[PDB]
Structure 1
Amino acid sequence: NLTEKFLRIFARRGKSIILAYDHGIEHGPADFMDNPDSADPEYILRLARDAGFDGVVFQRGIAEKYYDGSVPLILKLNGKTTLYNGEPVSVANCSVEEAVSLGASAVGYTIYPGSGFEWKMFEELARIKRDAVKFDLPLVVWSFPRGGKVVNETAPEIVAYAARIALELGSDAMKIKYTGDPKTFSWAVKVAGKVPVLMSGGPKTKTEEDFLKQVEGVLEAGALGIAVGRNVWQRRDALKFARALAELVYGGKKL
């Protein structure tokens, strides 16, 4: 059971915080100017360690050149850029077998349900899923409806759809966008059934409190925890704030 393996490794305390760092490809280095140290993957590793987080997410080139075994690794297999203008598509730049050699404990893959290319991502995910089972690595799906009829990616019915698709396609854990409230987000958590849900952190919030309140909602809705990037490492007080998130998520008490 790969969900069980995922939980043992990335959620030993009953909840999970994953430090996300595929941003160098997805958005590029404009994400790193706020807190320049954030451009250094070594800083990101020390940050995940010192904050007591469960994992990091790296693309293959970052894992190859920097990964040191110090925090469990989710190797994000596919990536695209924001420079790209077509219907959304993100293709694997790494195999599951290569992810094993690079020290990963899980693999990650983004799908964009609704895209004119949804078929292209589903077809490749099928091959990656088969390899995840073969190599006994949990498959984590970033499920981000985009393109086609999608006009509001955080609408309740869009996020619930995102969650259900990830279940249906064989994910062992998933990452979806937050709806902005616990009632509608708990519907997504429910339809995902036995597969645990991680909240995608999103653009840096106006205040730290705004983020903490979102995280409380996610936990209220019954999600497993968060896969957070900017709302930690785009902050000059990254470590102090990361520590406050750890206490909220692992501590389990009402703000």
Structure 2
Amino acid sequence: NLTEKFLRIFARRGKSIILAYDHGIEHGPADFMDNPDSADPEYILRLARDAGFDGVVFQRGIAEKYYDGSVPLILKLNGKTTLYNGEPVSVANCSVEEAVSLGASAVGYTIYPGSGFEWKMFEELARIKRDAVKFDLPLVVWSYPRGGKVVNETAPEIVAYAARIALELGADAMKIKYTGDPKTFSWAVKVAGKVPVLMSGGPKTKTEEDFLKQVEGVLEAGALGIAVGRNVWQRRDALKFARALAELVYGG
């Protein structure tokens, strides 16, 4: 049972905080400027360890050059850029077998339900899923409806659709966007059934209290925890705020 394996490694305290760090390919380095140490993967590993978080998310190149075994790794297999203008598509740049060789405890893959290329990602995810089972690595699916008929990615019905597709296609855990309130988010959590749900972090909020309030709602809705990037490492008080998130999530 790969969901059970995921919970043992990444949620030993009953809830989970993952520090996401695929931003270098997805958005590029501009956002690293507010807190420049954030461009150094070594800083990121130290932050996760010092805040007592459960894991980090790296692309293959960062894992090969920097990963040191100090915190559990989710190897994010696909990536795309914001420079791209076509229908949303993100293809694998790494195999599951290679992810095992790089020290990963799980693999990650993004889908964009609704995209004109939704079929390309479903076809490839099928091969990745089959390999994840073969190598006994849990599959974490980032489910982000985008393209086609999608006009509001945080609409209650779109987030609940995101959650259900990830379950149907074989995710062992998933990452989805927050709706902005615990009632509607609790429906997304419910339709995901046995597969745990992590809140996607998002752009840096206006105040720390805005983000902590969103986290409180996610937990109230029955989610497993958060996968946070910018709202930790883009802050100059990254470590102090990370430790406040830990107390909210693990203590609450």
- TM superposition score normalised by structure 2: 1.00
SS in 1 for 2:226: strand
Summarize deviations over 1:144-166 as a string: whole Å, max 9, x none: 00000000000000000000000
Summarize deviations over 1:38-69 as a string: whole Å, max 9, x none: 00000000000000000000000000000000
SS in 1 for 2:198: strand
Q: Structure 1 residues 29-38 or 1-10, which shifts more?
A: 29-38
CA distance in 1, matches of 2:227, 2:215: 11
SS in 2 for 1:3: helix
- Structure 1 residue 237: deviation in Å? 0.2
Indicate yes or no: 2:95 matched with 1:95. Answer: yes
Summarize deviations over 1:148-190 as a string: whole Å, max 9, x none: 0000000000000000000000000000000000000000000
CA distance in 1, matches of 2:11, 2:25: 27
Partner of 1:191: 191
CA distance in 1, matches of 2:118, 2:230: 27
CA distance in 1, matches of 2:238, 2:119: 39
CA distance in 1, matches of 2:12, 2:191: 24
CA distance in 2, matches of 1:72, 1:31: 25
CA distance in 2, matches of 1:89, 1:166: 16
- Structure 1 residue 113: deviation in Å? 0.2
Q: C-alpha root-mean-square deviation of aligned residues, in Å? A: 0.3
- Structure 1 residue 84: deviation in Å? 0.2
Summarize deviations over 1:193-250 as a string: whole Å, max 9, x none: 0000000010000000000000000000000000000000000000000000000000
Indicate yes or no: 2:21 matched with 1:21. Answer: yes
Partner of 2:69: 69
CA distance in 2, matches of 1:194, 1:201: 22
Partner of 2:79: 79
SS in 1 for 2:142: strand
- Structure 1 residue 73: deviation in Å? 0.1
CA distance in 2, matches of 1:236, 1:89: 33
- Structure 1 residue 31: deviation in Å? 1.7
SS in 2 for 1:53: coil
SS in 2 for 1:74: strand
CA distance in 2, matches of 1:49, 1:94: 26
SS in 2 for 1:107: strand
Partner of 1:182: 182
- Structure 1 residue 125: deviation in Å? 0.3
Summarize deviations over 1:57-103 as a string: whole Å, max 9, x none: 00000000000000000000000000000000000000000000000
- Structure 1 residue 128: deviation in Å? 0.2
SS in 2 for 1:71: coil
Partner of 1:155: 155
SS in 2 for 1:185: helix
SS in 2 for 1:179: coil
- Structure 1 residue 124: deviation in Å? 0.3
Indicate yes or no: 2:231 matched with 1:240. Answer: no
SS in 2 for 1:17: strand
Indicate yes or no: 2:146 matched with 1:169. Answer: no
Partner of 1:59: 59
